[PDB]
């Protein structure tokens, strides 16, 4: 009794997984409660289309991820106007909010959430490397400087 899952019933798998199962299971329980659907030509193709469509969604998002990445990765250095450090020690911290605004003015929009200030909170003055977690895995890299106010 081949049947296509609509959810993660017990150990049968997850949504969209044709599996051989004893007739009774689906003939009177899985199907009349809507937890799964019989594996028939029409239904299986539609689910496989849904499968490949989410794969295309995954492709498209990860494709646009590398887009943002390169857009700003290759150089694209930005600097902000921070109160003159005066012989060093900066007069303030450069936070996620401020650093996101800087790259956003450059064009490459970034939300502070994505920003990940490595090994510090941008306390010194002058040049300081940065990084951005553009995607769920893709890592970037940008050079940011500081000057007078």
């Amino acid at each position: 009794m081949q049947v296509i899952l609509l959810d993660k019933v017990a150990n049968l798998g997850s949504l969209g997984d044709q599996v051989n199962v004893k007739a009774g299971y689906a003939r009177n329980f899985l199907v009349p409660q809507g937890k799964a659907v019989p594996a028939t030509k029409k239904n299986i193709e539609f689910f496989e289309a849904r499968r490949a469509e989410l794969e295309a969604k995954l492709a498209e998002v990860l494709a646009a991820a590398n887009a943002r990445a390169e857009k700003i990765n290759a150089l694209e250095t930005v600097t902000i106007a921070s109160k003159a450090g005066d012989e060093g020690k900066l007069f303030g911290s450069i936070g996620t909010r401020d650093i996101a605004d800087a790259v956003t003015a450059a064009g490459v929009e970034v939300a502070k959430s994505e920003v990940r200030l490595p090994n510090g909170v941008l306390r010194t003055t002058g040049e300081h490397e940065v990084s951005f977690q553009v995607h769920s895995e893709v890592f970037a890299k940008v050079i940011v400087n500081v000057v007078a106010e």
Binding site: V31, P32, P38
Partner: protein, 77 residues
């Protein structure tokens, strides 16, 4: 009566044999069972008197397709 509503199976008659080949008249009746089939289109349970062989064809043919033939047959499910 003992008639399958899907396949139309009805009682048939035959012989009991023996080691002496003696023949006595008997009847073969279908393996009929009253089952409540879930029809998705009407979101309802419809009870049918089906044979065990009929149960197999319902999965293969679909619940809607068999009922369409039944309406053509005028079996009054």
């Amino acid at each position: 009566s003992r008639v399958c509503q899907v396949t139309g199976k009805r009682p048939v008659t035959g012989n009991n044999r023996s080691h002496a080949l003696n023949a006595t008249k008997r009847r073969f009746l279908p393996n009929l069972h009253s089952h409540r089939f879930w029809v998705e289109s009407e979101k309802r349970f419809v009870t049918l008197r089906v044979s065990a062989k009929g149960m197999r064809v319902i999965d293969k043919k679909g619940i809607d397709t068999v009922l369409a033939e039944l309406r053509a047959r005028g079996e009054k499910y």
